[PDB]
């Protein structure tokens, strides 16, 4: 095993710098989080009065508490207390360094980070979103990008190192061009017919579908027999393609043979594999087949390695924890059911747990396993599975990705107005007006009801602004030519936006101001901030670069809209209309009635004694092709995946009560879809995007896209500054009292002493915990005083020794700033210790954050971490441009949601602090879903359309006459936002990895 030992040594060598950066940044952010909000999640709403905790609606967990003005409030009759009960199995808080580090690792991996984000904001405050933004961008996105680049550069180095019958036969080879076109049209229309198989289809519709299927089968069988007759058995069987045609046709007729229709219910849709026959005319489908083929044939070794890894981990987890799961099932199981839904007793569920980990959800299944088993076994297994599992999956993803895709006065006035508009004064005025109007849309919130002055101010501002933007566009018309206006792309965006605004104002001032199309137009006022794309050079360049790839994006989008249609049809065939359930809606929470009391739809009417039995359907299901697509997307983004996976498994037959794990093997459908419409349908898009970017960068000759000329000269100047080989030494003065200090400093031990001192300061700051003993607190305070005093002493010593030559070094200034910041924080804490009127602990905590400079001082002593930070600050301009675009998109969708969903029932996804009522809350929700985290939860409240989930007769809430939303707009909104923010973040990753590649 010496060869593999050396290989892993080299691999860790390539991973050494990235691993150290990850560990160091994680530790720094863990200390920051600990100090900023330690012992804060313990808060719980407690009865005012052997204590009682209120529970969040739809959940059994206690309702967490905040005390500040911006943190989570508490209902009437309850006062918030610091009860010594950490939330969520008491395994998630910042009460100590270990827990803070685990929470920060979870935030980095984004494994349900939505829950931690919500809890921390609810307890600490709404102004601490900055910490989460910083850890997501600097921590999560950035560190993930460096790990990806490291693997990509590890693989590249590995590659571098490496009679009548005869008459019929004569007539049987017509093979006219019309034949193939007719066959293609036939299959297309067959798929179209099979794509309208819904739940409540009339018997006439069912008969029509049966007739269509049988006649199409007859046509395909006739073509098969006619072709095979045209040749002999020795021929027409030498090709895997016609072999596959034979398999599909024989399966089609064999299924027809049986009178039980679909025995497995997949045979009915097995006839959809022939849709791959469009591959011949579609190179995109051809390359999709090629990537799958390379997955099975080219990288088969890697694929089987991944398979054996998953199988082994699942089997080990089963054999180790199944007995404990069975014995203690009552601890983690839901209140009503007896067994845990996601457990590890049997091999199937253990493999499902391992697959969920590889999908990126392990904290909940680690919590449950810790509760129902030894904590030492759990942590080792889950962490090992996650790190090793996710590493193998990404290694395979990049291996397939590279292996495949890499192998009269009129003229006078015209000129005068041209000169006028060309003026930078007018340009800046227009930019200012656009940026003012963009931000002026944040005040049209739900809470605007109580403030009438803001309404009048906004109305007058918009009325003047639209006229200012009609004048601006009329000055453009009279200045520039009509041809060049209506040929430029941006001039339209402005013309259509102003047209929308003008017709909206016209409808408002005339009648018909409350009609549905006019309201929809008003909803389109959220596009107003979009006018700023043209006036900013960075955003204009970024959007030009994006639009340069729209053709390829659409080409891949079609080939994944078909490959998902296959699965949508197959799912609608497997279970359509079988998701309905009979629930017990007591006050605000429910459980499906036990099979004993109720067994089917009719029983819900016979047993309707209490009037609390409702027969309702899962919000997202496979009733028709549209909802099949929606569920497919929910499973693809790995959000809302569990709920449907429960409804599908608990389903027997139309109009029958769901039963616990009646279909325990229906998880395989979702597993197979995840694999195929995930891994591969994303690999294809990522390959196409990286080829399009390469060809758009090489053809135009301009690299480092997403950057303007000023940013380019800055980027040129920063590169020169970073690589400055020559340096001017500092002469040694003759005076002995300074020569002796210079001799001491020059010795290669001052740096070592400072390094060990800062390391010990880090350890001392780490040792602190929550509710520590007073002796520990006092010794820590004295040690902090000692450390700050010695650092200030040495800094002033060397500053005086170097005279004015101290500031020549770039980072000596940073050292001086951190030292003086420590001194100021100490003297600002000492003065606060007195009366000083009134103060709050959070102020002390934030003031004590200045100690992190003494930790950041270790950067200058790093090996490659300084280089990585240099690359980050070198990419900073491009990332700034793309972030500006992303924030513009976020503003657009925040206004859309803030105008569309202010009246919705607060379900498990939307609560008091994460609604769309106000601009701040809208921004929190939009930032949360920018990672596609919790978007299913935010979508669920608006998928509801009737009782018991709503009260369409609820007073006010006239958006839909009630307090529930419209799926038609909700699905569009959320799907479009997630796709757009996925493309934009992919652009960010491309920028970062191309910069690091340099
Ligand atoms: C959902 C779809 C899942 C899998 C894709 C299967 C592709 C089937 C292609 C049938 C057409 C065929 O037969 O194509 C033969 C031709 C020419 O072949 P020839 O005449 O040169 O010899 O070549 C080709 O285009 C195909 C060559 C590449 C094969 C790619 C697929 C490899 C494995 C996929 C299936 C694995 C099991 C999945 C189970 C899920 C449940
Ligand atoms: C992929 C395409 C379609 C996948 C569809 C889902 C897989 C199961 C299909 C199916 O109906 O399979 C037959 C049964 C279904 O069992 P059940 O859901 O009724 O639950 C058990 C309840 N009891 C014990 C009372 C019978 O399962 C069994 O025989 C277990 C073995 C089924 C193997 C299915 C493999 C599918 C994966 C990819 C292609 C290979
Ligand atoms: C953005 C994200 C990350 C990227 C970081 C990139 C690094 C940027 C700073 C370092 C840098 O690029 O270098 C800037 C210059 C270097 O000058 P030079 O060598 O070119 O001059 C040569 C002069 N000749 C020619 C005379 C020899 O100057 C310096 O390094 C001085 C930098 C001064 C920084 C002061 C910051 C300290 C203040 C606050 C500390 C707060 C601690 C608490 C934290 C709370 C919890 C998080
Ligand atoms: C092939 C890829 C390799 C992948 C990594 C493999 C290496 C790591 C394996 C796992 C090692 C785990 C060691 C600890 C084992 C359990 C020890 C144990 O008894 O639990 C201790 C705690 C649980 O405390 P509690 O009951 O909640 O009580 C609260 C408080 N402590 C009290 O005193 O009342 O629970 C803990 O032990 C706290 C755990 C903190 C975790 C910190 C984050 C780690 C991030 C990820 C690291 C790996 C990367
Ligand atoms: C990358 C692109 C490809 C992969 C991603 C594709 C994702 C597609 C998701 C769209 C699903 C649409 C969907 O499910 O429609 C459903 C909506 C709402 O129906 P309803 O009136 O409540 O009636 C319920 C009944 N069961 C029914 O379906 O009738 O039916 C409606 O009445 C809405 C009509 C418009 C739907 C438009 C959906 C846009 C999806 C955009 C996805 C890509 C984003 C970019
Ligand atoms: C959130 O804010 C509330 C309101 O300020 C805090 O309530 C207060 O909590 C303190 C500490 O538990 C209570 O102090 C004790 O009061 C009793 C008398 O009732 C006294 O004998 C003890 O020596 C001690 O001073 C205080 O009474 C209580 N106030 C009320 C009105 O209940 C709450 O602690 C805060 N929660 C957090 C985690 O900050
Ligand atoms: C919903 O599911 C339940 C349970 O499967 C169905 O209950 C069954 O209903 C029939 C008709 O009322 C009952 O039949 C009668 O049972 C008595 C007692 O055995 C017998 O003396 C009569 O001759 C007759 O067979 C049947 O017993 C009952 N099931 C059980 C287990 O008692 C119900 O009909 C279903 N509803 C629908 C409309 O699907
Ligand atoms: C068991 O009995 C209760 C009580 O009669 C039934 O409640 C009723 O359920 C229907 C369907 O969910 C509700 O219909 C809706 O009412 C709202 C107005 O409240 C209306 O806007 C909707 O268009 C729709 O008609 C109905 O209101 C509700 N009645 C009450 C008093 O809550 C329940 O459906 C029964 N369960 C079964 C399985 O039959
Ligand atoms: C992509 C290519 C295929 C598109 C396939 C498009 O198929 C559209 C149909 O599924 C729509 O069915 P409906 O929503 O009209 O069914 C309603 C049924 N009830 C409510 C009357 C019972
Ligand atoms: C043909 C198939 C040959 C055998 C398997 C070929 C190799 O399949 C690898 C995939 O299963 C790995 O993906 P995961 O299962 O981790 O799912 C992650 C999906 N996202 C996160 C990318 C969407
Ligand atoms: C990474 C380092 C930065 C992390 C995010 C740091 C986020 O800090 C936000 C501060 O505004 C917290 O509030 P303060 O303590 O400044 O003021 C308290 C005022 N009230 C709330 C009591 C009225
Ligand atoms: C361009 C203009 C917008 C820049 C961006 C403004 O910030 C947008 C979001 O970060 C939300 O910021 P908030 O200030 O609403 O954060 C919550 C504060 N309260 C409401 C809790 C006090
Ligand atoms: C279904 O819901 C009803 C209504 O909640 C339950 O009936 C009673 O509801 C009250 C609360 O309104 C509880 O205090 C009682 O304990 C419930 N029990 C009964 C039978 O009166 C009903 O029990 C629920 N059924 C099931 C099987 O959960
Ligand atoms: C870094 C030096 C000082 C310590 C060396 C030991 C290593 C293993 C470190 C890493 C994680 C550390 C632990 C992290 C958090 C806690 C919980 C706290 O309530 C007491 C200290 C304690 C238990 C720490 C002790 C030291 C520790 C175990
Ligand atoms: C029908 C139920 C049991 C689900 C099983 C999966 C079905 C639908 C599909 C998925 C992938 C398919 C295979 C994909 C590729 C090929 C190669 C081709 O040359 C002959 C058909 C064959 C061998 C297919 C057989 C049927 C298949 C296994
Ligand atoms: C609200 C409605 C009425 C607005 C409609 C605006 C439409 C007509 C605009 C928006 C973007 C425009 C395109 C943007 C850029 C170009 C390239 C150039 O060759 C001129 C035509 C063409 C292709 C434009 C055609 C018209 C266009 C599609």
Author numbering: 232 to 280, 295 to 407, 651 to 895, 1136 to 1726
Share the article's original sentences.
Voltage-gated sodium channels (NaVs) selectively permit diffusion of sodium ions across the cell membrane and, in excitable cells, are responsible for propagating action potentials. NaV1.8, one of the three tetrodotoxin-resistant NaVs, is distinguished from other isoforms by the relatively depolarized voltage-dependency of activation and inactivation, slower inactivation kinetics, and an increased persistent current; These attributes make NaV1.8 principally responsible for inward currents during the rising phase of the action potential, and contribute to hyperexcitability and repetitive firing in the dorsal root ganglion (DRG) neurons where it is primarily localized. Multiple studies have linked NaV1.8 to nociception and chronic pain. Here, we used mammalian HEK293 cells to express full-length human NaV1.8 and determined the structure, with and without ProTx-I bound, by single-particle cryoEM.
Attempts to improve the resolution in this region through 3D classifications steps, masking, and local refinements did not improve interpretability of VSDI but did reveal separate classes (denoted Class I and Class II) showing a distinct repositioning of the VSDI S4-S5 linker and a smaller movement of the lower portion of the VSDI S6 helix; The final apo map and structure was calculated from all particles making up Class I and Class II. Typical of other apo-NaV structures, the apo model shows features characteristic of an inactivated channel, with gating charge residues on all visible VSDs showing ‘up’ conformations and the IFM fast inactivation motif on the VSDIII-VSDIV linker buried in its binding site between S6IV, S5IV and the VSDIII S4-S5 linker. Similar to a previous study, the quality of the map allowed modeling of N-linked glycosylation at several positions (Asn residues 312, 819, 1312, 1328, and 1336) on the extracellular loops, as well as possible cholesterol, lipids, and detergent molecules bound to the transmembrane region; similar to other cryoEM structures of NaV channels we observe density for a bound molecule in the intracellular pore region, which we putatively assign as cholesterol. Density corresponding to VSDI is almost entirely absent in the 2D and 3D classifications, and in the final reconstruction, even as portions of the N-terminal domain (NTD) can be observed at lower map thresholds; this result is consistent with a prior report. The pore diameter through the intracellular gate is ~3 Å, consistent with the conformation of the S6 helices observed in hNaV1.734 and which allows space for the bound cholesterol molecule in our maps. The apo structure shows an unexpected movement of the Domain I S4-S5 helix, and VSDI was unresolvable.
